[PDB]
């Protein structure tokens, strides 16, 4: 921060004695079930070398975790969201550039423990018959422990350019009724993938053997709410003061199939079975400091 | 935040040098036992591209955990709240849109631990008769630990649209006298569901064998207090400057039956037995910046 | 909060550029030993749709944990506070409404741990006579852990209406000289209830076998201090601008009896043996912004 | 707080655009060793319904932990402080009332853990002679854990009235050279009470067998510093604008006797052996906003 | 800090009543995949003895973790980033000096635990025949535990001069499917290096046996975002008021080869196989307080 | 605090719209090696009933841990600081009083844990000859755990009067190469006191067998820095506006002797062997708000 280099806090920050023009744009893609919300802020600081537009992508991409196939009482299929994506793209001919983004990729940590224990024990025994016994022993043990945090979904900033930026929230792993954690590549020779299996050998229809959405992560059914921010810089002496920007909301859906074998249920997971895409184009006028769709 | 993109804090936030019109609306549904309270705030920022109304749904939905049936001393029934819901809906013909909402769905995390231990031991024994013995051995152990936090009730934002938004607080699981935790699908071959069982094989009336409401979660008996916020945006150049909005308070009640078998009590739980709904319509005038019921 | 919906903090809060009229009302009920204190604040914000009165119930309800009966050296009785209540009630004919209250009911959480360990061991033995032995083995262990916090007293907001609000601080459980925790329903076949038993088989008078109040919770003897807040809203265009309000301080006392059996002490607990009630009526003038008793 | 009821922070607090008259009064009781300090603040807020006086009792009551009796090398006695008290009392004829106090009694909590583990093991053995053996077994274990914090001294607000308020800091328990913790009622059939016993069977004079004051709690020797606050309210329209107040500092001292039995030391503790009281009268003038002794 | 030396906070900090000239410079190296961003701030405080320029190197260096070689189904190679470097260099003839930098090197800590346990046990045994046995024994154990945090990547400030400064974020170690942690020098006699090996003895093509980039650290694939700050000081009385500065982004890539032996996969890691460099020259005018490329 | 009694923060604090006269006085006692520093602040608040002088005693008292005696290679002695004292004294005839001090004595706490575990196990054994065996058993265990923090040095406020105040920082205990902790009274029958013993049976001169000062606490060698604050109150109507104050810095040094027995080293500690005292007199002029030496 500034205080680490003997500079008063907020000295080198943009947005002092500057008028900021904010705005909201709301759309609902009903077929894709995506509530898209763009919150824009035009900043024109006279002490900054260009004009700034801060675009915040918000809203909610619905999860749509649901049983979609019922082939009798012995086989069923469930579609579930494995990834949510949000992308912002500038046309190649534009002179506006993407300058900053948030959140970024963080360095994950883990805790390591090492233990060395050694001990000695003695023992003397006997009985009423007069026999007396003895024993002396020693032991040594070495232990290692690894501890780290595993979120259900990870937010990753995809490698950005001056024209394109993107975020993806991907499924990492989940706990199924205190078991697991299970991921998309979990495999068991008997039960296959048990990511969303309710009972291992229950006697019911395959559509009734899926995990309750209430017991799973809330992002699977009720969806994910993006909270991403991008900064676009525009040269002041540019000839054209109009820009186009594309905002893409995406949902990748995997297919989890449950089938009844001779004695027990077996689960399989197919990755990236479906993709739901919702694009929207926006016009930015830097002179009027306005954004429309 | 703004400081992460080299922008002064609060620069891109609405509500600077603006007069805000606040108001309170209080209703009591005695039949459903719901104390409904709407706190509204009209914000007309000149630098924002439309008019904002912030509606905060508050109050208290009573739990109404109570014994409702008594079939002698051998069978009884208890009604208990399994879900509380709060929904805000706009008519389809309205031009006002739902733009933001709080709280949202968060990503839950868990902590993983892996342990590897290996050890060597050795002991020599003996007795007065001159017998001498020896023993040497080794051992290896691998362990895995999963740690996570489970609340009694989960707050979930249902997939919102531009016209509808909703929150549900649902029962997750509960600890019954240091046992459990038990949920709505807990099943024991002998006792069935022990969610609200007081004694396993007590000799008393079935109406006296339910868990004390003091020993259970306070949301079950005294109720839940919503604290939800919604933002509705209205275009300034819109012709009609009046809006209608519906606010729904809901309580889903499950039925827990206790019956005395030959030797011990047995509990069963039926889901969504009853639903208590309380609707209220509100008129919003954007010109007078006022809200009425 | 406001920052979560892109709104400057404190923008939608009441109490800007207005004058607040505060006051204090102190009473002491010597018979019930109740120090009642009402701190009121009249807020008339021109930007709010009605007049607000914030009433803070404070003071101290004494515990009065004391040995009250001495039937020789073999039987004794102790009165102890099991519940403290604070209630605010408006007459049904009043047009003023209770709008908000604090504290409310919170969702309690618990921490769950699951552990799976598997290990292999092997040892070889042998004496001096040439005998050689061998052993190889495996083991598997599964463990579950539940961790949560248990306060001595629970603070619960009883289901409020537009005319009535109430809080109760009830006894949950207590630790007796590092044993327990014991509650009002604790029962041992030999010693009965050991909530306040000092010694299990001590040879003294029954009045000297009760737990020292210093070693127990301070709320039992010295008492509990309420810190509750209520908000009452009054319409400005109302004809009558005078209100009456009742404030009730309550203390429920349980009776713990210690009796000497043939070889050991035995304790019993009777619930809600006594109730100490202290009512007070207050007049609120919204025109003078004043409160009296 | 105010923010919990949609009210700006500090809106309903006393002391806005008000002149506050502060003052200090310092006394030293040499025979009781008590440095008494009263810090008073007169607040006359025009928007408050009466005049406030905030009195802060501070200073230091010396501990005076010391060996006072030496009956040869076989018996000795030590006086140690078991309680410190601070009291503020108003005469019954006064019209000023005690309205608020700090600190108050808090609800103590504890952490509960429950663990259930089950495991299976199996091993096959053998020897060079051809004998082959086998063993298979199972085990189950249940555990409970209670964890809580124990301070050396507890601060308790005694039941206050409109004319009297008091605090007591009492001895709870102490650790003696990593043993214990020991309290005033700790009893051992061999050593009696080992609260301040240095060695169990040391060969020295009884006056040299007491715990070093440096190794014990600092409150025992150097003393305790009160930090208590009281608020006294006075009606503005009262005829007499002069008040008298008594401030009492107290120190209760227990007597710990060490006597040498045939083989080992034995300790006994007598409670409330001595009481040191230091009272002081103060005159409060509400017109001059002044306080003297 | 200042408060530690009795000085008001921020008293000795630069940037009081000073106008600050900020600016942004964005470049994209397509072949190296590096989004470079420089945020500069000119500070001319009249109370400071020279002119300050704060340069923040931001952006994103892409990871580019990818399988690049496929020699059939038995051999494959993967390029992965082992280091990210950011360097700022001033020509030797310049009179501007590098004065401060952030972040710096921090002192890492670890937690040490030592345990000593001793115990005694005794048991008596017998059978129906009348034989009575006895056993008594003792044991002592000593243990040591070391605990510390290991990040996946570590950020190190390389030894700076008055003309050059640099940071490197280097790969420390990673967890592979709850195993490890593995580093660049991890070696196993059977499997070699298992840093990115998916299955130990899977039957698949070598290009399909690499760890999923989603399961690994996000810096490996999506890349790293620098957040480094440098302060350059220029004398005001200097003749030439123009400076050149070189900013270099770097990515060192290691080569991880998987080959199928007779029965299992074997991994090898070659360090610093490739280096991707992206340099950019910038002109600083201290008179116009401007920066260009 | 003020907010706990419904009073705005800082309302009852001294130092509003008041000019404060600060000053520094630095002395170095070369023979005692004590850097004495007094930071004084005169406060004359018109709303306070007397004049305040805040004196902060700071600086550094050198530890002076050093080997001072060398009688051959068989025995040696080391002087080390066991206590650092800082005292402020007013002459008895002075009318100025000591009113407040910091830091004060705090109440130390400890964590108590209690565990109860019970379990059942059962195994069946056998062999090829047809022998079949069985075993069933139960176990119960009770455990207690005490946890607390032990600083190397304790800071204690000695019982102050209106004319004298003092602080002492005394040695509590120390860890010697992961052993201990050892205190001044530690005694082992073979090695005596091992506080600063480097090796138990090393073959070297006794002057080379002392613990490295780098491996011990930094206060022992480099010294302790006082940070104490005192407040002196002066009546405004006092005839004499001149005060004298004595400031004492003190260092108590213990003598640790290492002597070589027949087979091993033996350590002894003598308490309070030396006392280094450094007094300084200061004159306070309340009229001109000045302080000199």
mmCIF file with all atom_site columns, C-alpha atoms in Angstrom, chain C residues 10 13-16 19-24 26 28 35 37 39-41 43 54 56 58-60 62 100 102 104 130-153 155 173 175 178 180-181 212 214-219 221-223 225 231, chain D residues 1-8 11-14 45 47-50 52 97-101 104-129 139 146-148 150 154 156-162 168 170 172 183-185 233 271:
data_model
loop_
_atom_site.group_PDB
_atom_site.id
_atom_site.type_symbol
_atom_site.label_atom_id
_atom_site.label_alt_id
_atom_site.label_comp_id
_atom_site.label_asym_id
_atom_site.label_entity_id
_atom_site.label_seq_id
_atom_site.pdbx_PDB_ins_code
_atom_site.Cartn_x
_atom_site.Cartn_y
_atom_site.Cartn_z
_atom_site.occupancy
_atom_site.B_iso_or_equiv
_atom_site.pdbx_formal_charge
_atom_site.auth_seq_id
_atom_site.auth_comp_id
_atom_site.auth_asym_id
_atom_site.auth_atom_id
_atom_site.pdbx_PDB_model_num
ATOM 1   C CA . UNK C 1 10  ? -25.661 4.984   5.757  1.00 0.00 ? 10  UNK C CA 1
ATOM 2   C CA . UNK C 1 13  ? -30.619 5.181   7.423  1.00 0.00 ? 13  UNK C CA 1
ATOM 3   C CA . UNK C 1 14  ? -32.942 7.345   9.513  1.00 0.00 ? 14  UNK C CA 1
ATOM 4   C CA . UNK C 1 15  ? -31.650 10.212  11.622 1.00 0.00 ? 15  UNK C CA 1
ATOM 5   C CA . UNK C 1 16  ? -29.907 12.710  9.338  1.00 0.00 ? 16  UNK C CA 1
ATOM 6   C CA . UNK C 1 19  ? -33.104 16.685  16.352 1.00 0.00 ? 19  UNK C CA 1
ATOM 7   C CA . UNK C 1 20  ? -33.517 13.747  18.736 1.00 0.00 ? 20  UNK C CA 1
ATOM 8   C CA . UNK C 1 21  ? -35.178 14.108  22.138 1.00 0.00 ? 21  UNK C CA 1
ATOM 9   C CA . UNK C 1 22  ? -33.788 11.620  24.654 1.00 0.00 ? 22  UNK C CA 1
ATOM 10  C CA . UNK C 1 23  ? -34.897 10.812  28.174 1.00 0.00 ? 23  UNK C CA 1
ATOM 11  C CA . UNK C 1 24  ? -34.498 8.460   31.106 1.00 0.00 ? 24  UNK C CA 1
ATOM 12  C CA . UNK C 1 26  ? -35.817 4.944   36.513 1.00 0.00 ? 26  UNK C CA 1
ATOM 13  C CA . UNK C 1 28  ? -37.054 0.395   41.660 1.00 0.00 ? 28  UNK C CA 1
ATOM 14  C CA . UNK C 1 35  ? -34.288 -2.021  38.896 1.00 0.00 ? 35  UNK C CA 1
ATOM 15  C CA . UNK C 1 37  ? -34.760 1.697   33.467 1.00 0.00 ? 37  UNK C CA 1
ATOM 16  C CA . UNK C 1 39  ? -34.170 5.046   27.875 1.00 0.00 ? 39  UNK C CA 1
ATOM 17  C CA . UNK C 1 40  ? -36.325 6.677   25.219 1.00 0.00 ? 40  UNK C CA 1
ATOM 18  C CA . UNK C 1 41  ? -35.429 8.618   22.086 1.00 0.00 ? 41  UNK C CA 1
ATOM 19  C CA . UNK C 1 43  ? -36.868 10.874  16.328 1.00 0.00 ? 43  UNK C CA 1
ATOM 20  C CA . UNK C 1 54  ? -36.844 4.084   20.309 1.00 0.00 ? 54  UNK C CA 1
ATOM 21  C CA . UNK C 1 56  ? -34.458 0.735   25.381 1.00 0.00 ? 56  UNK C CA 1
ATOM 22  C CA . UNK C 1 58  ? -32.369 -1.751  30.645 1.00 0.00 ? 58  UNK C CA 1
ATOM 23  C CA . UNK C 1 59  ? -31.677 -2.153  34.348 1.00 0.00 ? 59  UNK C CA 1
ATOM 24  C CA . UNK C 1 60  ? -31.155 -5.298  36.374 1.00 0.00 ? 60  UNK C CA 1
ATOM 25  C CA . UNK C 1 62  ? -32.007 -9.601  40.558 1.00 0.00 ? 62  UNK C CA 1
ATOM 26  C CA . UNK C 1 100 ? -38.616 -3.141  14.901 1.00 0.00 ? 100 UNK C CA 1
ATOM 27  C CA . UNK C 1 102 ? -33.432 -6.020  18.837 1.00 0.00 ? 102 UNK C CA 1
ATOM 28  C CA . UNK C 1 104 ? -33.616 -11.126 17.297 1.00 0.00 ? 104 UNK C CA 1
ATOM 29  C CA . UNK C 1 130 ? 15.322  -70.927 18.161 1.00 0.00 ? 130 UNK C CA 1
ATOM 30  C CA . UNK C 1 131 ? 11.543  -70.486 18.014 1.00 0.00 ? 131 UNK C CA 1
ATOM 31  C CA . UNK C 1 132 ? 10.621  -67.859 15.410 1.00 0.00 ? 132 UNK C CA 1
ATOM 32  C CA . UNK C 1 133 ? 7.210   -66.219 15.170 1.00 0.00 ? 133 UNK C CA 1
ATOM 33  C CA . UNK C 1 134 ? 5.454   -63.789 12.856 1.00 0.00 ? 134 UNK C CA 1
ATOM 34  C CA . UNK C 1 135 ? 2.368   -61.601 12.829 1.00 0.00 ? 135 UNK C CA 1
ATOM 35  C CA . UNK C 1 136 ? 0.783   -59.298 10.248 1.00 0.00 ? 136 UNK C CA 1
ATOM 36  C CA . UNK C 1 137 ? -2.441  -57.344 10.629 1.00 0.00 ? 137 UNK C CA 1
ATOM 37  C CA . UNK C 1 138 ? -4.599  -54.499 9.385  1.00 0.00 ? 138 UNK C CA 1
ATOM 38  C CA . UNK C 1 139 ? -7.095  -52.126 10.960 1.00 0.00 ? 139 UNK C CA 1
ATOM 39  C CA . UNK C 1 140 ? -9.658  -49.536 9.874  1.00 0.00 ? 140 UNK C CA 1
ATOM 40  C CA . UNK C 1 141 ? -11.375 -46.851 11.961 1.00 0.00 ? 141 UNK C CA 1
ATOM 41  C CA . UNK C 1 142 ? -14.194 -44.399 11.248 1.00 0.00 ? 142 UNK C CA 1
ATOM 42  C CA . UNK C 1 143 ? -15.000 -41.488 13.540 1.00 0.00 ? 143 UNK C CA 1
ATOM 43  C CA . UNK C 1 144 ? -17.440 -38.595 13.728 1.00 0.00 ? 144 UNK C CA 1
ATOM 44  C CA . UNK C 1 145 ? -17.141 -35.474 15.879 1.00 0.00 ? 145 UNK C CA 1
ATOM 45  C CA . UNK C 1 146 ? -19.688 -32.754 16.656 1.00 0.00 ? 146 UNK C CA 1
ATOM 46  C CA . UNK C 1 147 ? -18.609 -29.463 18.229 1.00 0.00 ? 147 UNK C CA 1
ATOM 47  C CA . UNK C 1 148 ? -20.795 -26.535 19.280 1.00 0.00 ? 148 UNK C CA 1
ATOM 48  C CA . UNK C 1 149 ? -21.037 -23.778 21.879 1.00 0.00 ? 149 UNK C CA 1
ATOM 49  C CA . UNK C 1 150 ? -23.522 -23.978 24.769 1.00 0.00 ? 150 UNK C CA 1
ATOM 50  C CA . UNK C 1 151 ? -24.234 -20.733 26.665 1.00 0.00 ? 151 UNK C CA 1
ATOM 51  C CA . UNK C 1 152 ? -25.460 -20.856 30.240 1.00 0.00 ? 152 UNK C CA 1
ATOM 52  C CA . UNK C 1 153 ? -28.483 -18.709 29.332 1.00 0.00 ? 153 UNK C CA 1
ATOM 53  C CA . UNK C 1 155 ? -31.697 -14.977 24.903 1.00 0.00 ? 155 UNK C CA 1
ATOM 54  C CA . UNK C 1 173 ? -27.384 -25.721 31.378 1.00 0.00 ? 173 UNK C CA 1
ATOM 55  C CA . UNK C 1 175 ? -21.273 -26.864 34.888 1.00 0.00 ? 175 UNK C CA 1
ATOM 56  C CA . UNK C 1 178 ? -16.225 -29.353 36.381 1.00 0.00 ? 178 UNK C CA 1
ATOM 57  C CA . UNK C 1 180 ? -22.021 -31.837 33.755 1.00 0.00 ? 180 UNK C CA 1
ATOM 58  C CA . UNK C 1 181 ? -23.367 -29.893 32.118 1.00 0.00 ? 181 UNK C CA 1
ATOM 59  C CA . UNK C 1 212 ? -21.778 -21.682 46.317 1.00 0.00 ? 212 UNK C CA 1
ATOM 60  C CA . UNK C 1 214 ? -19.780 -17.623 43.555 1.00 0.00 ? 214 UNK C CA 1
ATOM 61  C CA . UNK C 1 215 ? -19.025 -20.936 41.816 1.00 0.00 ? 215 UNK C CA 1
ATOM 62  C CA . UNK C 1 216 ? -22.228 -20.810 39.741 1.00 0.00 ? 216 UNK C CA 1
ATOM 63  C CA . UNK C 1 217 ? -23.277 -18.392 37.006 1.00 0.00 ? 217 UNK C CA 1
ATOM 64  C CA . UNK C 1 218 ? -23.392 -14.767 38.130 1.00 0.00 ? 218 UNK C CA 1
ATOM 65  C CA . UNK C 1 219 ? -26.886 -14.389 36.642 1.00 0.00 ? 219 UNK C CA 1
ATOM 66  C CA . UNK C 1 221 ? -27.485 -14.612 42.288 1.00 0.00 ? 221 UNK C CA 1
ATOM 67  C CA . UNK C 1 222 ? -26.547 -11.091 41.181 1.00 0.00 ? 222 UNK C CA 1
ATOM 68  C CA . UNK C 1 223 ? -29.068 -11.039 38.333 1.00 0.00 ? 223 UNK C CA 1
ATOM 69  C CA . UNK C 1 225 ? -29.249 -6.837  32.955 1.00 0.00 ? 225 UNK C CA 1
ATOM 70  C CA . UNK C 1 231 ? -39.107 0.921   17.806 1.00 0.00 ? 231 UNK C CA 1
ATOM 71  C CA . UNK D 2 1   ? -27.107 -1.063  17.843 1.00 0.00 ? 1   UNK D CA 1
ATOM 72  C CA . UNK D 2 2   ? -28.748 1.740   15.870 1.00 0.00 ? 2   UNK D CA 1
ATOM 73  C CA . UNK D 2 3   ? -27.603 0.245   12.557 1.00 0.00 ? 3   UNK D CA 1
ATOM 74  C CA . UNK D 2 4   ? -29.588 -2.907  13.367 1.00 0.00 ? 4   UNK D CA 1
ATOM 75  C CA . UNK D 2 5   ? -32.807 -0.846  13.395 1.00 0.00 ? 5   UNK D CA 1
ATOM 76  C CA . UNK D 2 6   ? -32.032 1.274   10.308 1.00 0.00 ? 6   UNK D CA 1
ATOM 77  C CA . UNK D 2 7   ? -30.842 4.240   12.392 1.00 0.00 ? 7   UNK D CA 1
ATOM 78  C CA . UNK D 2 8   ? -27.590 6.137   11.890 1.00 0.00 ? 8   UNK D CA 1
ATOM 79  C CA . UNK D 2 11  ? -28.180 9.183   16.676 1.00 0.00 ? 11  UNK D CA 1
ATOM 80  C CA . UNK D 2 12  ? -29.774 8.230   20.019 1.00 0.00 ? 12  UNK D CA 1
ATOM 81  C CA . UNK D 2 13  ? -26.695 8.881   22.183 1.00 0.00 ? 13  UNK D CA 1
ATOM 82  C CA . UNK D 2 14  ? -26.333 11.655  24.756 1.00 0.00 ? 14  UNK D CA 1
ATOM 83  C CA . UNK D 2 45  ? -27.688 17.949  27.437 1.00 0.00 ? 45  UNK D CA 1
ATOM 84  C CA . UNK D 2 47  ? -32.235 17.441  24.549 1.00 0.00 ? 47  UNK D CA 1
ATOM 85  C CA . UNK D 2 48  ? -32.043 15.081  27.547 1.00 0.00 ? 48  UNK D CA 1
ATOM 86  C CA . UNK D 2 49  ? -34.768 15.066  30.182 1.00 0.00 ? 49  UNK D CA 1
ATOM 87  C CA . UNK D 2 50  ? -32.418 15.384  33.187 1.00 0.00 ? 50  UNK D CA 1
ATOM 88  C CA . UNK D 2 52  ? -26.270 13.362  34.117 1.00 0.00 ? 52  UNK D CA 1
ATOM 89  C CA . UNK D 2 97  ? -31.180 8.184   41.140 1.00 0.00 ? 97  UNK D CA 1
ATOM 90  C CA . UNK D 2 98  ? -28.643 5.665   39.892 1.00 0.00 ? 98  UNK D CA 1
ATOM 91  C CA . UNK D 2 99  ? -29.585 4.982   36.270 1.00 0.00 ? 99  UNK D CA 1
ATOM 92  C CA . UNK D 2 100 ? -26.774 3.018   34.602 1.00 0.00 ? 100 UNK D CA 1
ATOM 93  C CA . UNK D 2 101 ? -23.644 1.090   35.514 1.00 0.00 ? 101 UNK D CA 1
ATOM 94  C CA . UNK D 2 104 ? -22.551 -5.703  34.039 1.00 0.00 ? 104 UNK D CA 1
ATOM 95  C CA . UNK D 2 105 ? -22.912 -9.464  34.388 1.00 0.00 ? 105 UNK D CA 1
ATOM 96  C CA . UNK D 2 106 ? -22.191 -11.408 31.204 1.00 0.00 ? 106 UNK D CA 1
ATOM 97  C CA . UNK D 2 107 ? -23.448 -14.827 30.142 1.00 0.00 ? 107 UNK D CA 1
ATOM 98  C CA . UNK D 2 108 ? -20.587 -17.318 30.191 1.00 0.00 ? 108 UNK D CA 1
ATOM 99  C CA . UNK D 2 109 ? -20.391 -19.988 27.497 1.00 0.00 ? 109 UNK D CA 1
ATOM 100 C CA . UNK D 2 110 ? -18.737 -23.365 27.062 1.00 0.00 ? 110 UNK D CA 1
ATOM 101 C CA . UNK D 2 111 ? -17.796 -25.597 24.145 1.00 0.00 ? 111 UNK D CA 1
ATOM 102 C CA . UNK D 2 112 ? -19.126 -29.150 23.880 1.00 0.00 ? 112 UNK D CA 1
ATOM 103 C CA . UNK D 2 113 ? -17.641 -31.956 21.782 1.00 0.00 ? 113 UNK D CA 1
ATOM 104 C CA . UNK D 2 114 ? -19.128 -35.389 21.129 1.00 0.00 ? 114 UNK D CA 1
ATOM 105 C CA . UNK D 2 115 ? -17.196 -38.146 19.366 1.00 0.00 ? 115 UNK D CA 1
ATOM 106 C CA . UNK D 2 116 ? -18.237 -41.590 18.144 1.00 0.00 ? 116 UNK D CA 1
ATOM 107 C CA . UNK D 2 117 ? -15.615 -43.935 16.700 1.00 0.00 ? 117 UNK D CA 1
ATOM 108 C CA . UNK D 2 118 ? -15.931 -47.504 15.465 1.00 0.00 ? 118 UNK D CA 1
ATOM 109 C CA . UNK D 2 119 ? -13.262 -49.730 13.987 1.00 0.00 ? 119 UNK D CA 1
ATOM 110 C CA . UNK D 2 120 ? -12.373 -53.231 12.864 1.00 0.00 ? 120 UNK D CA 1
ATOM 111 C CA . UNK D 2 121 ? -9.031  -55.028 12.990 1.00 0.00 ? 121 UNK D CA 1
ATOM 112 C CA . UNK D 2 122 ? -7.725  -58.397 11.853 1.00 0.00 ? 122 UNK D CA 1
ATOM 113 C CA . UNK D 2 123 ? -4.367  -60.154 11.999 1.00 0.00 ? 123 UNK D CA 1
ATOM 114 C CA . UNK D 2 124 ? -2.948  -63.540 11.008 1.00 0.00 ? 124 UNK D CA 1
ATOM 115 C CA . UNK D 2 125 ? 0.005   -65.020 12.897 1.00 0.00 ? 125 UNK D CA 1
ATOM 116 C CA . UNK D 2 126 ? 2.350   -67.936 12.358 1.00 0.00 ? 126 UNK D CA 1
ATOM 117 C CA . UNK D 2 127 ? 5.647   -69.560 13.229 1.00 0.00 ? 127 UNK D CA 1
ATOM 118 C CA . UNK D 2 128 ? 8.345   -71.721 11.668 1.00 0.00 ? 128 UNK D CA 1
ATOM 119 C CA . UNK D 2 129 ? 6.741   -74.919 13.014 1.00 0.00 ? 129 UNK D CA 1
ATOM 120 C CA . UNK D 2 139 ? -14.387 -51.806 18.813 1.00 0.00 ? 139 UNK D CA 1
ATOM 121 C CA . UNK D 2 146 ? -16.202 -29.858 27.788 1.00 0.00 ? 146 UNK D CA 1
ATOM 122 C CA . UNK D 2 147 ? -14.013 -26.780 27.331 1.00 0.00 ? 147 UNK D CA 1
ATOM 123 C CA . UNK D 2 148 ? -14.327 -23.388 29.019 1.00 0.00 ? 148 UNK D CA 1
ATOM 124 C CA . UNK D 2 150 ? -11.588 -19.956 33.969 1.00 0.00 ? 150 UNK D CA 1
ATOM 125 C CA . UNK D 2 154 ? -14.311 -12.829 38.538 1.00 0.00 ? 154 UNK D CA 1
ATOM 126 C CA . UNK D 2 156 ? -19.503 -9.381  39.355 1.00 0.00 ? 156 UNK D CA 1
ATOM 127 C CA . UNK D 2 157 ? -22.014 -6.534  39.466 1.00 0.00 ? 157 UNK D CA 1
ATOM 128 C CA . UNK D 2 158 ? -24.027 -6.976  42.651 1.00 0.00 ? 158 UNK D CA 1
ATOM 129 C CA . UNK D 2 159 ? -27.794 -6.411  42.443 1.00 0.00 ? 159 UNK D CA 1
ATOM 130 C CA . UNK D 2 160 ? -28.173 -2.629  42.076 1.00 0.00 ? 160 UNK D CA 1
ATOM 131 C CA . UNK D 2 161 ? -30.985 -0.363  43.196 1.00 0.00 ? 161 UNK D CA 1
ATOM 132 C CA . UNK D 2 162 ? -31.829 3.263   42.427 1.00 0.00 ? 162 UNK D CA 1
ATOM 133 C CA . UNK D 2 168 ? -16.959 -7.319  43.604 1.00 0.00 ? 168 UNK D CA 1
ATOM 134 C CA . UNK D 2 170 ? -13.631 -12.365 43.878 1.00 0.00 ? 170 UNK D CA 1
ATOM 135 C CA . UNK D 2 172 ? -12.128 -18.010 41.543 1.00 0.00 ? 172 UNK D CA 1
ATOM 136 C CA . UNK D 2 183 ? -9.770  -22.827 45.100 1.00 0.00 ? 183 UNK D CA 1
ATOM 137 C CA . UNK D 2 184 ? -10.809 -21.797 48.609 1.00 0.00 ? 184 UNK D CA 1
ATOM 138 C CA . UNK D 2 185 ? -12.709 -25.086 49.068 1.00 0.00 ? 185 UNK D CA 1
ATOM 139 C CA . UNK D 2 233 ? -29.578 11.287  36.980 1.00 0.00 ? 233 UNK D CA 1
ATOM 140 C CA . UNK D 2 271 ? -12.668 -17.470 54.678 1.00 0.00 ? 271 UNK D CA 1
#
